[PDB]
Amino acid sequence: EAMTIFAVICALIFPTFHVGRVWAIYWTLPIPNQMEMWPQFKSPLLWDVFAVSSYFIVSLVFWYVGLIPDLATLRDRAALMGRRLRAKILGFFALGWCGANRHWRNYEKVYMLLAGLATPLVLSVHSVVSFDFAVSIIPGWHTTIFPPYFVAGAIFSGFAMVVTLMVIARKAYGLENVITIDHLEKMNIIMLVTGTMVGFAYITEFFIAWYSGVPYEQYAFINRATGPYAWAYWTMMSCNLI
Amino acid sequence: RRPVEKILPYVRQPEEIIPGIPLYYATAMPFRGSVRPLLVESHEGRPTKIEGNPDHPLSRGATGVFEQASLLNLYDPDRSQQVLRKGEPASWGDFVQFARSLAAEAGTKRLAVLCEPSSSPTLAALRRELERRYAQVRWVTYRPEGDDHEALGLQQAFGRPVRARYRFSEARVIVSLDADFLGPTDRNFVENTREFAASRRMERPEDEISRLYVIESTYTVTGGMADHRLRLRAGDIPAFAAALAAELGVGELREAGARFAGHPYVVEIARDLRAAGARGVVLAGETQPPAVHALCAVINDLLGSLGRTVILHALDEPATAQHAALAELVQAMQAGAVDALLLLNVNPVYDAPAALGFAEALAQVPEVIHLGLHVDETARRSTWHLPSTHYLEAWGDGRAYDGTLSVIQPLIAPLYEAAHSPLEVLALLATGEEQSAYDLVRNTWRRLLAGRGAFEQAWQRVLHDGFLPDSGYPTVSLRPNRQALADWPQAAEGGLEVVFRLDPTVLDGSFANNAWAQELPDPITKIVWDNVAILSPKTAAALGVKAEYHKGVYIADVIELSLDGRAVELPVWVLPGHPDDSITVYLGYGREITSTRPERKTPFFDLDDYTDIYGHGAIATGVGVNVAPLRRPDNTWVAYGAQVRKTGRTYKIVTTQDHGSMVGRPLVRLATVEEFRKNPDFAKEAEPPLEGLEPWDQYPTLWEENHPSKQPAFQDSDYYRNQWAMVIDLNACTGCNACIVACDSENNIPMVGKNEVGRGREMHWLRIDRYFVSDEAHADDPQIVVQPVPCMHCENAPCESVCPVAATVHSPDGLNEMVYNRCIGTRYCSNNCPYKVRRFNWFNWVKTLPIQVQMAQNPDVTVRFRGVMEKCTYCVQRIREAQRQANIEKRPLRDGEVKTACQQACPAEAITFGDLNDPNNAVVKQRQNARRYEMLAALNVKPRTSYLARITNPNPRLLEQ
Amino acid sequence: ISSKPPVHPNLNMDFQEKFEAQELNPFFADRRAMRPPVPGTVPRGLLKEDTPFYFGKTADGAYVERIPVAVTPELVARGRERYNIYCAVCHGQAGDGQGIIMRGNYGYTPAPSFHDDRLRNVEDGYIFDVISHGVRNMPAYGHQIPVADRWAIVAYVRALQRSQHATAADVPEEVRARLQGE
Amino acid sequence: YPGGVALTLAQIEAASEQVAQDLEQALAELEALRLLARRDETLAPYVAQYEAILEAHQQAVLEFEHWKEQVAAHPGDYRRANRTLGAITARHEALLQQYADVAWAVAQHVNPALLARAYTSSGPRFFFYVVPPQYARQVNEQAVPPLQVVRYLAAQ
Amino acid sequence: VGKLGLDCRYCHNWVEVSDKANIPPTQTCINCHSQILTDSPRLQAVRDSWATDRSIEWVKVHHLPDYAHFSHASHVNNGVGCETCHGRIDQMDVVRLVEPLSMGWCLECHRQPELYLRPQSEITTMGYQPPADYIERNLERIRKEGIRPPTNCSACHY
Numbered sequence A: 001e002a003m004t005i006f007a008v009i010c011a012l013i014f015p016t017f018h019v020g021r022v023w024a025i026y027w028t029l030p031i032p033n034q035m036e037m038w039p040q041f042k043s044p045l046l047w048d049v050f051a052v053s054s055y056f057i058v059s060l061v062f063w064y065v066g067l068i069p070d071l072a073t074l075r076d077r078a079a080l081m082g083r084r085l086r087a088k089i090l091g092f093f094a095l096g097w098c099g100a101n102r103h104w105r106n107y108e109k110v111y112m113l114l115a116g117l118a119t120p121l122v123l124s125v126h127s128v129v130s131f132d133f134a135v136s137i138i139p140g141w142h143t144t145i146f147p148p149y150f151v152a153g154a155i156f157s158g159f160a161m162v163v164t165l166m167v168i169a170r171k172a173y174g175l176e177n178v179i180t181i182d183h184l185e186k187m188n189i190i191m192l193v194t195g196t197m198v199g200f201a202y203i204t205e206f207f208i209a210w211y212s213g214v215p216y217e218q219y220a221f222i223n224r225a226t227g228p229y230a231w232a233y234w235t236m237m238s239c240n241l242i
Numbered sequence B: 001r002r003p004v005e006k007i008l009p010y011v012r013q014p015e016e017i018i019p020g021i022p023l024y025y026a027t028a029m030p031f032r033g034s035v036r037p038l039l040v041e042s043h044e045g046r047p048t049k050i051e052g053n054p055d056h057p058l059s060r061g062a063t064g065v066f067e068q069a070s071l072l073n074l075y076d077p078d079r080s081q082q083v084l085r086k087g088e089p090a091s092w093g094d095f096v097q098f099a100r101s102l103a104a105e106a107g108t109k110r111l112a113v114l115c116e117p118s119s120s121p122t123l124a125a126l127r128r129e130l131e132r133r134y135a136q137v138r139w140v141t142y143r144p145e146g147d148d149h150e151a152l153g154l155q156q157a158f159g160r161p162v163r164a165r166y167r168f169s170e171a172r173v174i175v176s177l178d179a180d181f182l183g184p185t186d187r188n189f190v191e192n193t194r195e196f197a198a199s200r201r202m203e204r205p206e207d208e209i210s211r212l213y214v215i216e217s218t219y220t221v222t223g224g225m226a227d228h229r230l231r232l233r234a235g236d237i238p239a240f241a242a243a244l245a246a247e248l249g250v251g252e253l254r255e256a257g258a259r260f261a262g263h264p265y266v267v268e269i270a271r272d273l274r275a276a277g278a279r280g281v282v283l284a285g286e287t288q289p290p291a292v293h294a295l296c297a298v299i300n301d302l303l304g305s306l307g308r309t310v311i312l313h314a315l316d317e318p319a320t321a322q323h324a325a326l327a328e329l330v331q332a333m334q335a336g337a338v339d340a341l342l343l344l345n346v347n348p349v350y351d352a353p354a355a356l357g358f359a360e361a362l363a364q365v366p367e368v369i370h371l372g373l374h375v376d377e378t379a380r381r382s383t384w385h386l387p388s389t390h391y392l393e394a395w396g397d398g399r400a401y402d403g404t405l406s407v408i409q410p411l412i413a414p415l416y417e418a419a420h421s422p423l424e425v426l427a428l429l430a431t432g433e434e435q436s437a438y439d440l441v442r443n444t445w446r447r448l449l450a451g452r453g454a455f456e457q458a459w460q461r462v463l464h465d466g467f468l469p470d471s472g473y474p475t476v477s478l479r480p481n482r483q484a485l486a487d488w489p490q491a492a493e494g495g496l497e498v499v500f501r502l503d504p505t506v507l508d509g510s511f512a513n514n515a516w517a518q519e520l521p522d523p524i525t526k527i528v529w530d531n532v533a534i535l536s537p538k539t540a541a542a543l544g545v546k547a548e549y550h551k552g553v554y555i556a557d558v559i560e561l562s563l564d565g566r567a568v569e570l571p572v573w574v575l576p577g578h579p580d581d582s583i584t585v586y587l588g589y590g591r592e593i594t595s596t597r598p599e600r601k602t603p604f605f606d607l608d609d610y611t612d613i614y615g616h617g618a619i620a621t622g623v624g625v626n627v628a629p630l631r632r633p634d635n636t637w638v639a640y641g642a643q644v645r646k647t648g649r650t651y652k653i654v655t656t657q658d659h660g661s662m663v664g665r666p667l668v669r670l671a672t673v674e675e676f677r678k679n680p681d682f683a684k685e686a687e688p689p690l691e692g693l694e695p696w697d698q699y700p701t702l703w704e705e706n707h708p709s710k711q712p713a714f715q716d717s718d719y720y721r722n723q724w725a726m727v728i729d730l731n732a733c734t735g736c737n738a739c740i741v742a743c744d745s746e747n748n749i750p751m752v753g754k755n756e757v758g759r760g761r762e763m764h765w766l767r768i769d770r771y772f773v774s775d776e777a778h779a780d781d782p783q784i785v786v787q788p789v790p791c792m793h794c795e796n797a798p799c800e801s802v803c804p805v806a807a808t809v810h811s812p813d814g815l816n817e818m819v820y821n822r823c824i825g826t827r828y829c830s831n832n833c834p835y836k837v838r839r840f841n842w843f844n845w846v847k848t849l850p851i852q853v854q855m856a857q858n859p860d861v862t863v864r865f866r867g868v869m870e871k872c873t874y875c876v877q878r879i880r881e882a883q884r885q886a887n888i889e890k891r892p893l894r895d896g897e898v899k900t901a902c903q904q905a906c907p908a909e910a911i912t913f914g915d916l917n918d919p920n921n922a923v924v925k926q927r928q929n930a931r932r933y934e935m936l937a938a939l940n941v942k943p944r945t946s947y948l949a950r951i952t953n954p955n956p957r958l959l960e961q
Numbered sequence C: 001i002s003s004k005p006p007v008h009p010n011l012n013m014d015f016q017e018k019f020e021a022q023e024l025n026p027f028f029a030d031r032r033a034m035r036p037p038v039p040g041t042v043p044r045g046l047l048k049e050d051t052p053f054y055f056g057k058t059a060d061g062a063y064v065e066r067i068p069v070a071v072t073p074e075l076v077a078r079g080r081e082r083y084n085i086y087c088a089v090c091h092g093q094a095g096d097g098q099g100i101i102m103r104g105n106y107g108y109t110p111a112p113s114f115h116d117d118r119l120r121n122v123e124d125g126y127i128f129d130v131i132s133h134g135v136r137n138m139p140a141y142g143h144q145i146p147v148a149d150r151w152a153i154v155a156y157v158r159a160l161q162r163s164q165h166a167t168a169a170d171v172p173e174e175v176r177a178r179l180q181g182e
Numbered sequence D: 001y002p003g004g005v006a007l008t009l010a011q012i013e014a015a016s017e018q019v020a021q022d023l024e025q026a027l028a029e030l031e032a033l034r035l036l037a038r039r040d041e042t043l044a045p046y047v048a049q050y051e052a053i054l055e056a057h058q059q060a061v062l063e064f065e066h067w068k069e070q071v072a073a074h075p076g077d078y079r080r081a082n083r084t085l086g087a088i089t090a091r092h093e094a095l096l097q098q099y100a101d102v103a104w105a106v107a108q109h110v111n112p113a114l115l116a117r118a119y120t121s122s123g124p125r126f127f128f129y130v131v132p133p134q135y136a137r138q139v140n141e142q143a144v145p146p147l148q149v150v151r152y153l154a155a156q
Numbered sequence E: 001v002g003k004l005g006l007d008c009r010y011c012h013n014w015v016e017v018s019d020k021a022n023i024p025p026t027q028t029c030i031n032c033h034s035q036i037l038t039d040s041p042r043l044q045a046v047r048d049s050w051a052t053d054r055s056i057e058w059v060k061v062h063h064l065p066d067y068a069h070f071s072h073a074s075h076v077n078n079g080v081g082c083e084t085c086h087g088r089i090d091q092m093d094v095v096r097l098v099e100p101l102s103m104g105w106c107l108e109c110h111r112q113p114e115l116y117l118r119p120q121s122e123i124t125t126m127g128y129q130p131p132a133d134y135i136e137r138n139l140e141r142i143r144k145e146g147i148r149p150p151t152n153c154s155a156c157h158y
């Protein structure tokens, strides 16, 4: 969730900044502002804001809650063996932790809750960020398979970076005994799942051009293979499929 | 925090005008030896936009491209701030004492002028009041691009000087013969346009239509909106017209046109024209020797059409032979005979081929005096350079082309101290103090008013009405009996044709520091900011050059054409229309300009070079290469002997279109009168409605019960009364390209630089995209189509849905209005729209805008800041002042109380714009017409501007194929 | 209260780079946006079509005896209203009872009562010209007021003249309350 | 938001009754136009040019009930009466104005002059130094008929 | 105003017919302050300005931005008063701009107009208490006059 939350930070900067008028973006928020104005909720560029301004939060609060026993462990160590006596006072993020029965059961059902309550959000966050494309009238976007697809792209992208971090978090500063290589083995399946689910959509794209496309959508994908970006798509699909 | 920006009202209130509201003064507009009419807005005595003169029947309220940029020539920076002597900006008050003492006690004094061509009586009469004193005034009218050549061919044909008018509504079939009658370069662009368009305007399942037959040597805009066009090198069009008339019956004429006995497009049209006597026309362009225009007189008289080629006797002005005077001028320069040299509005150092020297004489003679608007190459070389007024401060008089006798209203005081308009300067030479042009001009009229009412009821009436009504020359009859038939053997060949031709957006370079015009796509090719050479792929593939693009920017090779040891190079671009061994190098675009303002550097952290288009200098510098001096002044449009050298420095060349030739797509859907006679429901047949479902417009969505038009909050205002829409009679739409420029001035914009538009952004809202359609590339017959494309302000409107920051809405009356405030710049307003018309204020072009052009942006609309979209808005600004004026006093909006810029400027009455749901207006007649062409209707968008298709009209067989 | 120009954060588009009428223009000698027109210029729609209706210098005689327009009382409604805003200030609502300025002990030239018979028989085109061009001691007002108001004002006057020559005289005036202000 | 919705519900009724009384008048004129200009004009599009409005006017009557009943059903939302009333008067004055624009052409052919009692006929905005529109709205209101336009042509 | 009894159309002319009605020229003061006072060390700018060309350096207030246009005549002719919007000026030595003239308040009238609009009989009357039964006396005009205020983006923002 580190590898998520910081990605979301360097992500959210773009919607704040590929706009030309950054300073006038608080209008996008639904504050009762200095006039009787409010945003337009038919706009996936707005869904993105609430989504990411919820997804930065839920993923954080689910990570922060995820790491309570750490702060308990580190708060417990800061007194007897650690940096300073004043790391304990920094570790008040423990929030009066003792590992008790009364609230550890609650921690489980909450971790269950956010699992079954952040996944329905994850499938809406990236889907929103796909809805912005496919809601349009463009032929290369209006194809409806995209929200599952880009999600699989998020799988096939995200794990494709986690492994880059784990390899370099395994050579020098590594955990041979805890980051078992068998983990990365069973990790790349759910990558390779989307190594083919991503591939099936390219077929559908490349298919519907031949099946019942608009005479533009017929051309829209001939462009992708044959045209300026032949350097991209021939190699890209082949890269993501080979 | 904000400033306290004050307000400085009148002191000595002029009674008529009022602060907030403009009022329309009625000026003229000189160029090219004639004077189009015009009508300004004049916001509080400051001109902001020009318009047409609806009373003047020659124009009937229209303005081509070439005027609206002149409005910005008025407000240029780097015009003529100081008076320059020797090149030094020294002073004025000494010049009057100087030039006055030169003038009164002068005697013979042997002066010369080299004027802009007069077309005005105050100029031509003051010439006599001038020539009365000083003995010999050589008085050469240096026509831009030499003699007009329509007129010199006819002084012998009719035995005396004459000009034609060319109605074209009383006349159907038109062999052009290179004639750009529909060309903004040429004169009388309206009366050529309109009554030609009316012939093209059907409003019926079938009507009798022009069916021209153009035979151009260089692909030009008239050849586009056309039928059966042909490519054939100039310098041989005489040989074309030679075998032409022999197949009609005037004379033998066989030897000149040796090889066109039985050509299809010749023998085809010949039977038709003799079969259309009171309807056929024979024009003639400008790329010829004058015997062609004799043939334009011989056959057109012999054809029987005289009321269709309305002909009008000039005021005895046949003497415009460029050889006869301009050489004969410098033949006196080299002898020390002529002393003074009084240029008015011209750059002959820029122009004026070296084959007949000018600069070699200019440096010989002192007492040089250049009256001038810019400071280009003539001020820099002269000893005195007056500054010049534009025509907006002249009190000038002027003739419309061949007809009425108009007069300027001067609107603004001289913006610059001591401008000293040419007319009173020409009278300052007349041995008195600077004549008040207001009182000078008036003194001519009493000798020539031709109106029984005195001045303060007539002067006030003409200065009001814009045109002296009864004038317009008397109409001559047939003079020719086959006189002019003896300059044929100038059909010379044996070399690459190097023909010149003036783009619609510039005229002999005299309007180059003009962004609205300079960043104006040519209609042939959406080219901007560079002169070019256009030619065939067969010569290119036989020469070795290309218009290759691996970045969508058209990298270009070069030519390095060489004439008589006076070679220069330039970008070569290619077009599938032009013929073998010929290139149309456009002029202007090579006009060095000398700046008074700084280059305005800012830190490297800040962008100025990409934005400050007026920064690095003034505009006309280095935009291309100068080309005028190369030609030979004999038949001074054409040229031979270009020893081409494909050399390096292969640099960019930028366009808006960037491409062409739709792949058989539904975006123009041309159709024949044969096919149109068969299926009037063919604008829909390309993408018809569905199996058993409704017609396409007014097609229901998923929602119909909660649709906002059925809800009040969209329906409840003072607006729903009059839904607005804007059709386009595309049958008369050809790349005049003035549909743009009035949008640019009415609803303000900035310009864009080459360095910027190369990446593909242009802040022209109304794309005027052209397209090619060949028979699956059969013979590479282009058969172009032009069609404007504003933001068809949709109903379903994907863009409206998608601005999260509600900066878009289907405003009442089909209007889909943008707000340049609420937006933020996420640009997905644009990405939805099939028509990428939601432009975007990428950089802050207006912040770097100088203290000069700022007069021009009209004081009624929201100029826009970085990070903001923008689009057509149907010129909403003049909906508001009208609908507001109807909210004050209870009324509807008339059929013509409001006219948009695309409407009021397009001289072909293509756009009509009258409110939908008002059945008496023109739009409901033009929408209820059979071909309500609904562009990309198939996306269930339901838009307004349900415009029309073209109906190209081919010929029955007649040995056409 | 906040005596300085208040904080507006986004000054991007308040003071547009272009300038509307009656706005500062930092170029010209007289810092001003209007740049008044040159004499002799004429609009397209404001010619002296019918000189009677725009001027009184209308025939060989330079003045006119009667109003040219057919005068409904709705014209005179504006006459009454337009009088009591820019003409009753000095001549007064009653014409003779001098308005607040002249009854204000001030250094101003006293004007003649309209009820004087010398004014009760005058070319109405002259009294029009009194507005469009002014008089020896009095300014003009047709420099600014509409021209139909220059007529409506007169019908009210000529009617107000017809108040006298009848015993509908001595209208009550509210001037004293205006001298006090409270 | 002064006192709720029930206040405006009287005037919205006062608009719909004007429409109902105009069902008579418009359909009455639609008889009279067929009587007046039997054959004195093209009349083939130009009569249906007057009918095309009529199917819309009648359609709005059933709506003006639906518009209104959605208001009187719940009087607890002020932001529907001002809008339904702003819609009615516009959907009303439009159809009044559209009847007129089709009806002035009737006189335009029967009379060679579309009369000087046609509209306010004020002028452009720069024709305010001479003629404020205030004068004009007291000409237009007190001279021009809304739907006594063709009954006026019974006098001709 | 408060003790000279001038209504507002005198020197703020072109508020009945124009948009963005004008501050007066200098000429208006020269109607009377050419020969009424001729003494003060307070308006020597004025006398010199008529005797010169530098107009009077007037600051302004109420300057809503120039991307949101406005028209008094569109309001005034339809019955809106200056008490509502520009404040009670009759006792105001210098302008307080007691109203904000921002959108959120600009729009309360275009949603709730009949609380404000005047009968147009003597609209420029700072000492105006409206009658009782004001509202119902007003809505009968919106039913008749058919004003239909704007709620949209098209009106002022363009």
Ligand code: HEC
Pocket (backbone or CB within 6 Å): B007, E008, E012, E015, E020, E021, E022, E023, E060, E061, E062, E063, E064, E065, E070, E072, E075, E076, E080, E081, E082, E083, E084, E085, E086, E101, E124
């Ligand atoms: C009579 C009822 C009125 C008088 C007299 C004036 N107003 Fe208005 N007003 C309003 C605004 C928002 C402005 C600013 C204009 C702009 O920034 O474009 C104005 C302007 C004026 C001015 C001149 C100041 C200027 O040039 O900006 C004057 C003398 C003036 N107003 C007088 C707002 C309103 C408003 C609310 C709708 C009303 C009813 C009026 N103004 C009406 C009057």
Ligand code: HEC
Pocket (backbone or CB within 6 Å): C083, C086, C087, C088, C089, C090, C091, C109, C110, C111, C112, C119, C122, C126, C127, C130, C131, C135, C136, C137, C138, C141, C153, C157, E031, E032
């Ligand atoms: C407002 C519309 C009006 C009208 C209808 C008139 N005035 Fe005046 N006026 C003023 C003064 C001091 C004079 C006398 C000039 C002198 O002594 O030389 C006048 C003159 C007149 C006349 C007489 C013209 C004639 O026929 O001889 C008339 C008919 C007339 N006025 C009408 C003073 C003022 C004001 C003081 C500031 C103002 C305001 C007006 N006048 C305005 C009007």
Ligand code: HEC
Pocket (backbone or CB within 6 Å): E001, E006, E007, E008, E009, E010, E011, E012, E023, E024, E028, E058, E059, E060, E061, E062, E063, E082, E086, E089, E095, E124
């Ligand atoms: C001339 C004799 C005036 C009279 C009578 C009234 N006004 Fe005034 N007004 C006048 C001036 C010269 C100014 C400029 C302000 C300054 O800096 O002195 C004003 C100001 C206003 C304003 C504010 C405009 C601004 O500066 O932004 C308003 C709203 C205004 N005036 C309205 C107004 C009304 C309603 C009047 C009668 C009731 C009135 N003014 C009298 C000139 C004169």
Ligand code: HEC
Pocket (backbone or CB within 6 Å): C089, C101, C104, C106, E004, E011, E024, E028, E029, E030, E031, E032, E033, E036, E040, E041, E042, E043, E046
């Ligand atoms: C005739 C109708 C007047 C016009 C038009 C204007 N003003 Fe005036 N002003 C007038 C009077 C009779 C008085 C004096 C009343 C008093 O209480 O003494 C004034 C006063 C002023 C002042 C005050 C002078 C001082 O105390 O130093 C000023 C600054 C002033 N007036 C300014 C002014 C301006 C700027 C005007 C045009 C915009 C203007 N006045 C019109 C009478 C009349």
Ligand code: HEC
Pocket (backbone or CB within 6 Å): B718, B880, B883, B884, B885, B887, E064, E068, E069, E070, E071, E074, E075, E078, E080, E084, E085, E101, E102, E103, E105, E106, E107, E109, E110, E113, E116, E117, E146, E147, E148, E149, E150, E155, E156
């Ligand atoms: C009452 C208190 C109002 C305030 C405050 C504002 N407006 Fe207004 N406006 C009002 C009415 C009653 C009307 C309708 C008159 C009619 O007969 O239609 C209007 C109308 C407008 C319009 C009309 C559209 C046009 O003619 O261009 C515009 C543009 C408008 N109003 C603008 C506007 C602005 C910008 C305001 C505050 C900043 C504003 N109005 C306030 C009544 C009232």
Ligand code: HEC
Pocket (backbone or CB within 6 Å): A027, A035, A037, B806, B807, B809, B819, B821, B822, C010, E064, E065, E068, E101, E102, E103, E106, E107, E150, E151, E152, E153, E154, E155, E156, E157
């Ligand atoms: C008058 C007729 C208006 C209408 C209707 C709407 N707006 Fe408005 N808006 C108006 C003004 C005079 C102002 C200025 C307020 C100020 O801050 O000084 C505004 C403000 C805005 C803004 C904020 C601009 C800023 O600089 O802070 C926005 C983004 C805006 N208005 C948008 C907007 C939209 C989307 C509307 C309908 C679609 C709308 N406004 C109505 C005037 C008027």
Ligand code: SF4
Pocket (backbone or CB within 6 Å): B732, B733, B734, B735, B736, B737, B738, B739, B740, B768, B786, B788, B905, B906, B907, B908, B910, B911
């Ligand atoms: S519609 Fe546009 S391109 Fe066509 S002729 Fe008119 S201005 Fe030119």
Ligand code: SF4
Pocket (backbone or CB within 6 Å): B790, B791, B792, B793, B794, B795, B797, B798, B799, B800, B816, B832, B833, B834, B835, B837, B838, B871
């Ligand atoms: S075509 Fe584009 S700009 Fe025009 S209404 Fe539709 S989406 Fe908006």
Ligand code: SF4
Pocket (backbone or CB within 6 Å): B739, B740, B742, B743, B744, B746, B747, B765, B766, B790, B791, B871, B872, B873, B874, B875, B876, B900, B901, B902, B903
């Ligand atoms: S309406 Fe105006 S902005 Fe729109 S295309 Fe036409 S001229 Fe240009």
Ligand code: F3S
Pocket (backbone or CB within 6 Å): B802, B803, B804, B805, B806, B807, B808, B822, B823, B824, B825, B826, B827, B828, B829, B830, B868, B869
């Ligand atoms: S999507 Fe919307 S917020 Fe603006 S940049 Fe485009 S109109």
